[PDB]
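Record now logged for everyone:
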Amino acid sequence: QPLARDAMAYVLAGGRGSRLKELTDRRAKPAVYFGGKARIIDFALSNALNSGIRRIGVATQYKAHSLIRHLQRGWDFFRPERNESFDILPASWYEGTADAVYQNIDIIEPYAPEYMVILAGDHIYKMDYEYMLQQHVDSGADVTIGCLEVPRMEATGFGVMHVNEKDEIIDFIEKPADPPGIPGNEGFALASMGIYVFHTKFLMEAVRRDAADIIPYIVEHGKAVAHRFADSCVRSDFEHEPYWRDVGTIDAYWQANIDLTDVVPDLDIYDKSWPIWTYAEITPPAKFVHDDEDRRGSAVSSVVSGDCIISGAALNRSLLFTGVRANSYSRLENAVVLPSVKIGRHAQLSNVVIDHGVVIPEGLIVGEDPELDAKRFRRTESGICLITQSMIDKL
């Protein structure tokens, strides 16, 4: 009996993405657009669905308006008569991650799932959660915790799990200077994905027995085991390794998107085997016009969504979301361009993330003058400008 039939996925989607700065000023991190493909939250949601988990809850917190609208419009196909449910819970004040689940016990117990699968909604990755449920029951564990096997140095910006010979967890440190290594495989550490499988009876206990803090109390006073991302990752034939991304900074967000322009991308957005569902509208095709001595609308080494009209504009190494209008004599290079952006004639922009809906003035130049760029816009140390409508308005 597939254990997924009896599980509920509970998605924590209050993450602010503080380090994305003005990208997350009027939206939560899980609402952030990714890949010309989806919003970040759709990865976790899609994994649950693809894994056979048909009961999903999503707890929101900060600036959730657009996230909730997205869920309402995109994730609307679950029917309770078929033992399917999708609950949007702005329960999660809020006060904590644990409280996000606690305060909606009265939504959970009616469904009576045998298993809870707690998921962070702010990471991009694909995983078949049935593996982790089978480990969780077979192992007799109180909690199974999803983990990345990363080099000890890279584990420094992570909650890290110190394990023993058979993967049982003996301690946990937040951001360790010298991350405890894996026994017999030192120089790799086991970092926390913030993915926790429980028995539901147990967790209601844990939540209503310590609610009115932290559940690594289980580590010390109980039985926590570790599940490795590599044991249940989903990989397409065109992905050379298990893909996971945090896109925690403007650099990392830019990079993950622009990497999709590669000839052989790390993430395969063309894969059908483990599909990412999202909110999408019927959209006309992308259009390229003008082929002149002075202007040519085309794209090279780029990803272009539908309803994009590239009119005498030159795009190189760029990713455009739906709705973009790029106008004559403009040029984009190394640009990640969110939906519905307009690029005026003669504008030239390089190494930018352009926010949703921004109208870029005729003639604007970005990525020529680093000093002017840092005055007008959010510039990273690496040279990426994040451009919003409010930065454009005060020029």
About this structure: The chain is about 20% helix and 30% strand.
